[PDB]
Write a protein that binds this ligand. Sequence first.
Ligand SMILES: [Cl-]
Ligand SMILES: [Cl-]
Ligand SMILES: [Cl-]
Ligand SMILES: [Cl-]
Ligand SMILES: [Zn+2]
Ligand SMILES: [Zn+2]
Ligand SMILES: [Zn+2]
Ligand SMILES: [Zn+2]
Ligand SMILES: [Zn+2]
Ligand SMILES: [Zn+2]
Ligand SMILES: [Zn+2]
Ligand SMILES: [Zn+2]
Lengths: 478, 478, 478, 478
Amino acid sequence: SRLLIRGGRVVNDDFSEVADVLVEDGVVRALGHLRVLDAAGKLVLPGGIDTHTHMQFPFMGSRSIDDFHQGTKAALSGGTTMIIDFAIPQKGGSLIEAFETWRSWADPKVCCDYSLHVAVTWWSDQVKEEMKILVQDKGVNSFKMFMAYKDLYMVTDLELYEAFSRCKEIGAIAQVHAENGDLIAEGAKKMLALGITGPEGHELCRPEAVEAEATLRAITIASAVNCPLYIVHVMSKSAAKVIADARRDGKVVYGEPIAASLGTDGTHYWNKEWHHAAHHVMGPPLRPDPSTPDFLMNLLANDDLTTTGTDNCTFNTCQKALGKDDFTKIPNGVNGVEDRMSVIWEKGVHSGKMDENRFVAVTSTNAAKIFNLYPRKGRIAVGSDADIVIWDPKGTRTISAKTHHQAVNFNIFEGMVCHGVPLVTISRGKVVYEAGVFSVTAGDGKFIPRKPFAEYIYKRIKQRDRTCTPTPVERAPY
Amino acid sequence: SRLLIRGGRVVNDDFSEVADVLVEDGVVRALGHLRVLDAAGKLVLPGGIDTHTHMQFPFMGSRSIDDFHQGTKAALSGGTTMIIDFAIPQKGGSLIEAFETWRSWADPKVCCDYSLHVAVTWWSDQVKEEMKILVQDKGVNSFKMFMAYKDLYMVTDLELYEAFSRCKEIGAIAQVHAENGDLIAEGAKKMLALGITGPEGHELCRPEAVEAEATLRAITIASAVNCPLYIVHVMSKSAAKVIADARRDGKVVYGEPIAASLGTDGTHYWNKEWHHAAHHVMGPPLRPDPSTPDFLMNLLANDDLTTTGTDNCTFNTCQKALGKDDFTKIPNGVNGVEDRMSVIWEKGVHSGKMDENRFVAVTSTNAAKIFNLYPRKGRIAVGSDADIVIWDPKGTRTISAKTHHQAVNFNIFEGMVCHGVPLVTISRGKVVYEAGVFSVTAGDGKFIPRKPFAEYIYKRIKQRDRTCTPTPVERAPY
Amino acid sequence: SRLLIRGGRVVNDDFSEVADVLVEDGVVRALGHLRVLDAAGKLVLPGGIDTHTHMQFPFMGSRSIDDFHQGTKAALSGGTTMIIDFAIPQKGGSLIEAFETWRSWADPKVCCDYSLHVAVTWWSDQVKEEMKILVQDKGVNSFKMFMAYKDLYMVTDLELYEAFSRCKEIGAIAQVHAENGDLIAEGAKKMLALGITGPEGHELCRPEAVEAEATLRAITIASAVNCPLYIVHVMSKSAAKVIADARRDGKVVYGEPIAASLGTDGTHYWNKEWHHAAHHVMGPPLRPDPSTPDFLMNLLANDDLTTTGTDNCTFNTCQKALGKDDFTKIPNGVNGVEDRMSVIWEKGVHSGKMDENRFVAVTSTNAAKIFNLYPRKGRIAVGSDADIVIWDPKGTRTISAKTHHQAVNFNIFEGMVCHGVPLVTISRGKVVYEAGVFSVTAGDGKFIPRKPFAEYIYKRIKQRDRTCTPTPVERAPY
Amino acid sequence: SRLLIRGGRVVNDDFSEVADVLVEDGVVRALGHLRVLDAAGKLVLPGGIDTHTHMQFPFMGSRSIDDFHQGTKAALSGGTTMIIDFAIPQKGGSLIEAFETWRSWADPKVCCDYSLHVAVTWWSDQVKEEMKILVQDKGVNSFKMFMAYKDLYMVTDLELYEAFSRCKEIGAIAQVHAENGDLIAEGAKKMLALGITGPEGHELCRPEAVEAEATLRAITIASAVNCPLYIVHVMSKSAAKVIADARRDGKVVYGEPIAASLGTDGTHYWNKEWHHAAHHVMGPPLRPDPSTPDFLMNLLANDDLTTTGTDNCTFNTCQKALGKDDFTKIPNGVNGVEDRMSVIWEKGVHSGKMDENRFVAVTSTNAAKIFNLYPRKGRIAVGSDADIVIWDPKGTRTISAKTHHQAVNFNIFEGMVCHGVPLVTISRGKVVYEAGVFSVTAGDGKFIPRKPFAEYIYKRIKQRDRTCTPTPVERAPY
Ligand SMILES: [Cl-]
Ligand SMILES: [Cl-]
Ligand SMILES: [Cl-]
Ligand SMILES: [Cl-]
Ligand SMILES: [Zn+2]
Ligand SMILES: [Zn+2]
Ligand SMILES: [Zn+2]
Ligand SMILES: [Zn+2]
Ligand SMILES: [Zn+2]
Ligand SMILES: [Zn+2]
Ligand SMILES: [Zn+2]
Ligand SMILES: [Zn+2]
C-alpha cells in the first residue's frame, strides 16, 4: 500500500538530487530529504516507456510468441513499466474494430500500464471518420501509416497527404514506417531471381537509400500539410541524417531509434548459420555498417533523435524457419522490450555519450511529452504515477536468451555485458520485480487513454497556421 | 569555304593556348602557331551546346513564340551553336510519331546544328519497344520522364523504375523533371482556395522541399536499377545539395542548372506588376532566396553540377495573360537561349568562381561527353566540327528585350551588364553571326544523331553490373 | 512582502499549465489551482537570464554608458531579471583583483540579481592558482579566453590547451571568443591600406571563415583535453554550423547566439550614414547575409544552439565617433539587454519556430543549468527564487531608442514591432517594473555565487575520464 | 629509337579510343588508326605522376632505404614514370642549398623523370628571397609548409600567412601538412605518461579532429590571402570532408590522398605484433575507421579530392625498431611508390567507382595541370613526352614484400590481389620495364623544371584580385 524509497538519488530528465520517494495508492505523494526500500548509492528513475511493441501479432504466417502477459512481464524485468502497442487492421478492415480486438487481447493479460497506436492501413471517408472517434472516445492520439509493405499496408503519397491532414484536424501525431514499398518489392524479385534466398537478401533488397528516400518524402508531405511527424524504428545513418537536418531546418519531426539499431548491426545477416541471420530480420533491416550503433546513439544524446522503442516482435527459431528458402516468407521482428534500458545505459550512458538525465528523457520522458502522458509518466514528482525503477549503474549484467524473461528462444544482444541493472521495478505503486522474482498477476496493468493536441508538438504547429499561411500580393488586374 | 582564325587564344575544357584555327568544309583541319579573321587578344571557344530548349511548343493553351528558326537565330547571336530540344508526345501518343513531327518542324527551320531528347510520358510494352527503335534507328540516347505535371506527363515510381531499366538496357541516359506532382496539385488547390491567384502562388505551392524530395527519389530509383541519371533545370539550393551529395556517395547522376537559376531569382514573383511576375513562371519555379544564383554557380564551378541549359520556352506578355486570374493557367517557361553564355561568363568567370576552361566544359564540353557528341563538338581540335565563337572577355554588353534577337517581348535578365561578348559565331564552318548581322538561311542547321552507351557515363555503370552484383552466402540448409 | 499571481498560465522549460503563484520573502512558496496581480490570459515565465553583458566597461578609449544601475534597470524593463557580466583583467593584471573591482562597481548599483564570468587574458602559474581561488571562495564556475584581440587579450593554442585543462581540474566551464586574432590584425592592415576606413572594413577584414576556423579550433583543443566548452556571441551560419556538427559528433560544446545576431544583420555596415554603420560594430561582426537571423533562430529552436546573451556593450554616437577615420578605433559593442526577450519572442515564438517552453529554456533555463543556477533560477517552482515576468503574447510593442530604458542613444532593433510585452517584472519577490514605471532602488540586486562541476555539463565529462581513457595493447617486446 | 604501340586502346583523362602510338626520340610523334609492341586488348595510359615521395631522407635518426635509384626503379615496375620529391632544409638552413643537395642525390641515380617541391621550414627575409630564385632560376612552383612537427618544421599562423602571400606573388602553389603541431606534442606526452609506448599511441595522440582542424585553418589562411592551396597526404574522412566543402564554397584548394589511405586503414596499429603496427606509422596516421578507403576513393572519383601521391618514405623493420619503447622515436613513413597504380585500379576502377579516364586524371593528368606539366606529361598526344604504360585491366597481381621491387622488407598492401598489371613501362620513349625485367641505367631519368603561374590554378586567382578586392562606401565625413 505504502512505499518509501530511502536514500536514493532521484533522477529526472531535467535534474537529479538525493531525495526520498513516498508512494501511496499508485501515486508519488511526497518528495524530500508500510515497506521501506534501501536505495542508498542507487538511482531512482521513472519507469521506461517503450513506444513501439507488437505483442502476439498475427503478421506473416503466424503470431509472435511474446504476448501481452509475458511481453509485459519481460518489460518489467528490464525496467520498462509501460508499452505502447499497435492496433493493426487489414485493408478494408475497421480501425475501431482492430482497437477493440487489441484491447481484449491486452486488458486481461498486461502486467504493466499500456496504451495503443492505431494503424491507418487504407483510406476512405469511413477511415477518416473512425480516426475522429478513436481520438474523442477511445483515447488515441497517434496513427501509423505505411510506406512499405505493398499490397498489405502500403499507402500512396496522396493517401499520406490525406492521412496527415486528418491527423492535424483531430490533434493526433502521424507515425510513418519510412521505406519505399515499390523498391522493396522489385528488389526482392531481383534477389530471388539471382538465387539469394537467405536473410542477406532481405537487407540487400532494401539498402538504406530506400529508407532515407521515404523518410524525406514523409517529412516533405508532412511539412506541406503542417502535420507533426514521428518516424518509427530508425535503422540507418542516412535516415537519421535526414531527420536531423529536417529538424535543423525547423520541421516538426521526431525520430525513434530502437534497441536493435543502438545495440547491434546488420553484419549478422551474413552469418554462416541460417537461424542466426534470420533472427535479425526486420523492417527496415539492421545495417551492415558497424559504426551505425555509435552514430545513432550520438544523435540520440544530442536530441537529433528523441524517443526510444524496440519494435519487439519476437518469433521462435522454428517460427522464423517459415522462410528458410525464401527471405520474404521470414516473419519480421526482433527482441528488445526487456533489454532496451540496459543496452542504452551501456552503449549511451556508461560510454560517456549522454547524462543519466538524458537517458531518462530518452527512455521515458520524451515519449510522455509526445504522446501526451507528461507529467503523469516519465517523471518522479508529486502527483505522477508511481512507475519507478531502482537502478544500479555500478553493477553489471550479461544478456542471454538462456537467462532473459522473454518468450523468444534467441537474443540479438546475446553475450552483451551491460552496466545498469534494475534491482526493483515498481508498477502502479506496487513492487512487481525484485532480484529475478515477480510480484505481478495478469491484468494488473491498465490501459491509459491519451488526449489530442499534445502541447509539446502542437503549440508550434498551431502558430504556423496563424502566421505561416501566405497572403496574396495586392495588384491591379492586368 | 576556308576560314583562318588568326592570333586568337584557343580555349578548350582542359587547356588553352595561343594558336591559329584552319577551318575547311565545316571541320577544323589544322591547329598551330579564303577569309582571315583577326582574333588577336580574343578567345576562340567551342560553340555552346544548350542541352534544354522547347522551341514552338504547344504546351498549355498555346505554342511558344520562339520557333526553330528564330530560336536558333537567337542562339547563334549569343554564342550557342547547338540546341537539344524535346520531342513530347501526349499520354497514349506514339514516341516515334512525336520524334518525326518534331523533326519536320525543325529540319527546314533550324539555323544551327541540333538533336532531340524524347519524353517518356506514359508506360507500356509499346513505349518499351519504341524506345529501342529511337536509339538504333533515329539516333536518340536520352529520354525525359516527368515526376511533375499530374494527368499530363506524370509517371509513378514503378513506371520510373521501369523507364530507367529500359534506358539502361538500350544504352540511353535517363532525364527527369524532379518535382512531386501529387504535392504540386494539392498545393495549387490550397493557394487558389486561399485566393492567391497571382504568380506568387506558383512558387508558394511548390517550395524547394518538393523539388528536393523528387530529386532524391529519382536518384534512389536510378541507383537501385544502376541507370545513369540526369536532372534537368535544377532551380534550388536544396535540390542541388542532394545531387552534390549523391555524386559524393558515388551515384551516377548529373545536374543541369539553367541560365534562369544562375542569373536571376524568384523574388520577382512578388513584383507589383502582374506581367513582370508572370514572365518568371516556370517548373520548377525560380527561388525567393537571393543567394541561389551564387550557390548554384559555385557548385557548377566545382563540378557538383556539370552541364547548362536554358529551358527556353518563351511566351509573349499577352500569351502569358491566359492565367491572369489563375496561376495554373499561365504558360510556363522563360527566356535564356541567347543570353546563357554571357550570363554565365559574367556571373561565373568574371566573378572569379571558374576558369575560362571550366566555362567551356560547362557550356559545351560536358554536354558533348554526356550525350555522346565528344569530341565532334565541345572541342576545337583536328577533326571536330567547326562550331566556333570568337569571344571578347574585356568588352561589356547589356541584355535588353529591346535589343535581343529572341521573339519574346520580355527578358528576365533585363538590364544585366555582362562581360563576354560574341563578336563572331561560326556554325558548320560558316560565319553566321558578326557584329549584329546574320549570315544564315533557314534549314542550314542539321540534325546530328547520337549513339548509345556514352563511355563518359556508361563505362562505370557496366563495371557495376560485373562487380556490384551481390552473390549468395554459402550455407547449409536449415 | 507577499505576492499572489492569479489566473495566469505558468510556463516552464518542460511544461506549462494554468496555476497560481504564491511568492513570499523572495521565494515561490506555493503553486496550485498582501498584493494580488490579475494574470488571466497572460503568461507567467521565469525571469530572463542574460549570459553576456559588459556594463560600464573601459574597453578601447572609453567606457560603455550603460552602467550596472541603468543597465539592470533596462534589463528589468525588458523581462530580464539576471545578468552575468565579465570581469576583464589586463595582461599581467590579477584575476581576483579584477573580480573584486567589478564587484564594487556592481554591488551598490545593480537592480536585479547578477553573477560574474572571469576572463583569462594571460597565462602563468599565478593565473593557474587564481582560477582555483575564484571557484572555491568567490563562486565562479566560468572563464572566458580570447582567440581574438591580438596584444590585448589573445592567447595561443598552447595557452588555450592549458587554460582548458585548468577549467577541467577545478570544475569550471570554458568560454571562448572564437575569432582568429592573427587574421583580424593582418586583415585590418589590408583594409586601411586599401583606404576602407569605414565600418564596412570591420566586417570585411573578419569574414565568417575566420570566426568558423577559431570555433572549430576551440572545439578541437577542448575535445582533446575533455573540457566542456561554451562559445560566446555566435554571429555566423558557418560558426553555428560547426557547433551543431560538433555536438552531433558528441563534443561537449554549447553555443550562445545573441539578440543582435537573431534580430538584425550586417548589411547595416554598408549604410550611407556613418553613425548607423558604426552603431553595429562588434566582435564578431554582424553578417551581411540577410538569412542569418532565420538560420540562427532555427538551430536555437532545435537546441543546436542552447543559450542566449546580448553582449550588451553600448556606446553613444559621439563615443563611437572615436573611430570616424579608422574602423579599428571604433568602440565595439551593441545594445540588447532590454530587447532580448521581445526580439526572441517575435522572431522565434510568434514565427512558429519554437514553443513558449523552448523560449523559457532559451532565455533562462539552459543558462541556469550550464552555470549551475538551476532550479534556483530559470524555473517557477516551490523553492525557486521569485524572478518572474507576467508576459502578454497577444499585445505588440515597438522598439525605439526614443522609448527604451537603455542609456545608449541608438537601437539596432529600431522600428521593430515585437509581440510579447512584459507587463510586470518581479525581482527577488518584489514588483520592480509595471507598465513603464520602476519600483527599484540601487543595490537591491545581489551577487549570487555559483558552484563548480555543474552536473548538466560535467556528469558526462567525468564518465569520459573513466571509460574513454585509452589503454595499452599487450605485446611482447620486440 | 622508334616505338610503335599497335592495336592498343589509348586512354586519356578526357577520352579513350583505339589508336596506334608512334614514339620517336622520347616524344609521341603520331597517333592514328624499329620495335613494334602488340597492345591488342590492352590499355595505353600516360605514365603515373607520383606527387609525393621522400627518397633517401635523413628524417628522425636515420635515412629511408628506398633511394632515388631503387625508388624510381620500383616506381617504373608499378607504372609510375615520374616522381616529385621534397627538398627539406633544417630550421636556419638555406632553401637553395637543400634544393642543390637533393639534386646531386637524385640526378645520377634517378631512372625516371622527376622534379622537386621545396619546403619552407622557417621564415625570414632570406627565405622570402630564396623562394623567388627557386621559381625564376631553378624551376620550382611549389612550396611545402608544416603545421605539424613542433621544433622541427612547424610554423605559426602568421608565418603561414606570410608564406602563402609569397607563394602568391611569385606564382607558386602552397602545399601544407595539415596537423596541429601543438596538440600532437601535448598528446604524445599524455600517451607516454599513460604508458602507451606502442604504435597505437601514435594514432591516439593525433585523432582526425587534429588533422581536420589544421586543414580548415590552412584553407582559411589561404583564402584570406587568395593563395592556391594543396593539402598533402589526406588521411581522414573529416579532413577530406573539409576540403570537399571548401571547394564547394569556391575556395581554391586541392586534396592529395595517398595510396596508403586508399588501400589500407589504421586498425593495423592495434596488431598484436609490434613490427606490423610500426610499419604503418606515418603523419597523419592511418585511420582506425575501416570505411575510410571507401570514402576517400569516392570523393577522389567525384573530384572532391583530385591528385594522388604515396608519401613513400620506407624504413626497414630494424630501422623502425628505433622507437620500440617510444612511439615518437619510430621513423615515420610507409611504402606506396610501386603499388599506387594497381591499388587505385583495384579499389577505384574495378570497383566501379570511377572510369579508366578518371583513373588517368587521378594518377597523372591532374598532377600535371596543377604543377604546370600539362600537356607535356599526363597525356598521350602529339608533342607530349613518351611516358607510357601498357596496362592489362583483365589480369590480376598479388602485392607482396617478397615479390615487389622496393628496398623495404615490408608492404602495407601485403596479400592484396589487384586487377590492372603494368606489362610494359616506357620512360623517355625507351622501354624500361617489361614482364619483371628492367632495361634502365642510373641517371637515365632527368630533372624537369616547372614554370610559375599554372593556368589551371592561377587564372581564377588572378581574376579575384581584379574583382573581389573590396572598395570603400562613399560617405560624408561625420
Ligand atoms: Cl518468467
Ligand atoms: Cl533578328
Ligand atoms: Cl528610466
Ligand atoms: Cl630489382
Ligand atoms: Zn514498422
Ligand atoms: Zn513496428
Ligand atoms: Zn521540365
Ligand atoms: Zn523543360
Ligand atoms: Zn567577446
Ligand atoms: Zn563580450
Ligand atoms: Zn607530410
Ligand atoms: Zn611527406
